[model samples]
Target: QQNNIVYFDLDKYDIRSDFAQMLDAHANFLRSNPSYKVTVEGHADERGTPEYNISLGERRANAVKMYLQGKGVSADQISIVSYGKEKPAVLGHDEAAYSKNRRAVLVY
Candidate 1:
């Protein structure tokens, strides 16, 4: 399976060059497989207001979508949702957990 998850820095949604490679792989596959669709789920660490986090999560998701579109992936092939801090990959109040929590994932 391809790496469907891309991470972000604290309060950041910019796609890093490292994750850009990963996303490029995804974009290539999606470009080849037009029938496939992906939902970009945005997430955030638990350190801000729920409302703010949700918007931040959306920004993160949109960032990924824009990247995919730049690589020629059709907008119709993508969807996005934000979970804010509701679902976390790690459970802790430290940098490790926060880092893991702040991410957007491609769900096929």
Candidate 2:
């Protein structure tokens, strides 16, 4: 089965407590299915300069990767990329929408 994924908060590189379950599930799935390879697509809300947003997005992805690695997921099984503010989860300029837009997407 495909592994479940989770997202992070706005302007933050740390994984929140709420996403612990999702992260755990992902790690469990990878452990169970050794052949599965996952990609983490990190994104940022449209609230900052492009260059800054890209760096922030990378940090978010790396943070998730680090957490998963700590949880026993192999480093080589996961890869990361940043979307920055180019891809918004919600279409709006408000903080309410931006919060949801800034996230890391896990894909297989």
Candidate 3:
């Protein structure tokens, strides 16, 4: 299966073209399988305070949720949670790792 993960730019919740494509796959899948529900896990890099990062993470997840909704996925089919900087997909202090950490993940 393709990665249902989408990365965000520093402090930006906007979805990139490539990530939009990734969501397209997910939207299509979910629309076809209405019975399958998904949770959008939002995350942020470990730079800001935990509280701020949590909100940033939430915005990122909302971005994904809106994108999927625009693609015809039902709102009820998706749930969202913010991990903020608590979860790092890549463990490192560098920009490369930070970039990877800023993301919204689709979990079924």
Candidate 4:
């Protein structure tokens, strides 16, 4: 479950080195499970306009997708979507919740 969720900074989509290791593990899993098809669902905090959020969300999802591709996960095995600020994991207006909301969740 933890491997399926990776967070991002306020408005950034870059994956950190620490999180990169976790994502590598996920990539390995996907490699072994040949039939697995995963969707990278990007999200953002409630601080931006919907339009901006959605674009940021796509960038976030692409960051992860590209990472997986580097690890040998076929492009055909993954798809991307942006939820923007519409589907937050945590509900609130504070940084704590905002941090949790800014993430990409792997849906299989």
Candidate 5:
């Protein structure tokens, strides 16, 4: 659950772990591929209003952008989006699914 993904706490957008060098791998790829761009899609659980969720998703996505920048990834190499609560990774009204849903995904 902790590998190949980064999860966020409720109402939080802070970067937690470095996540098994995956972000570094992504950064390396991005550094090498200047013409390539990535999309960081932020998602949230279905627990808040659409407006709040949208902002939170953006915060999460920006948090990811900041991390990538810190890793030497360029701003032009990344774009961010918020799926908010519209795209649930799992269909459930429980914490298990909610936790999975609260995340930022990388689209290469």
Candidate 6:
């Protein structure tokens, strides 16, 4: 089973051009392996309020899900989860660190 995952930008839920390619690869992988299930785990920087961050995370995850579905991946094979600011990829409050922390992770 291949774990195809993509990352997003900081404090942004919309999929940018760079991420689009990554998602495309993931979509292709899913298409090739019909039995594979993917989990889109959305995350956020520690700058916003917890509630708002979680919502943003959900937005990011949903955005990825939407893109995958558009690429012909089954909605049922994908799951969405919001980790918000709880799971920091880089543990620091600085802009550089926060930027690295805010992202949507692909898990399988």
Top model by TM-score, which number? 1
Tens-digit per-residue lDDT, 18-88, candidate 2: 78888889888887888899999888888779999999999988988898899989998999999889887
Off by over 4 Å in 5: 1-4, 18-20
Q: Relative to the true structure, how large is the alpha-carbon lDDT of every model?
A: 0.93, 0.83, 0.91, 0.91, 0.85, 0.82
Ranking by lDDT: 1, 3, 4, 5, 2, 6
Give all TM-scores, in the order shown.
Answer: 0.95, 0.90, 0.94, 0.94, 0.91, 0.89
Candidate 6 C-alpha lDDT tens digits along 1-108: 123445556666888776777788889999999999999888888877999999998998899999999999999889999988888788876988877766777888
User: What's the lDDT for candidate 4?
Assistant: 0.91
- What is the Cα-based TM-score of model 6? 0.89
Model 1 score (lDDT): 0.93
Measured by lDDT, the strongest candidate is 1
lDDT of 1 by residue, 1-108 (tens): 248888889889999998888899989999999999999999999999999899999999999999999999999999999999988889999998898889999998
Error of 4 at 71 (Å): 0.6
lDDT of 5 by residue, 66-106 (tens): 88899888999999999899888899999999999899888
Q: Model 4: residues >4 Å from true position, as ranges?
A: none
Model 4 lDDT per residue over 1-106, tens place: 2768889887899998878888888899999987999999999998969999999999999999999999999998999999999988889979999999999988
RMSD to the true structure for each prediction, in A, is: 1.5, 2.6, 1.5, 1.1, 1.8, 2.7
- Give Cα distance to truth, residue 33, candidate 1, Å: 1.1
Worst 10 residues of 6 by lDDT: 1-10
Name the regions of candidate 1 deviating beyond 4 angstroms: none
TM-score, candidate 4, is 0.94
Worst 10 residues of 5 by lDDT: 1-10
Q: What is the lDDT of residue 35 in candidate 5?
A: 92
Report backbone clashes per prediction: 0, 0, 0, 0, 0, 0
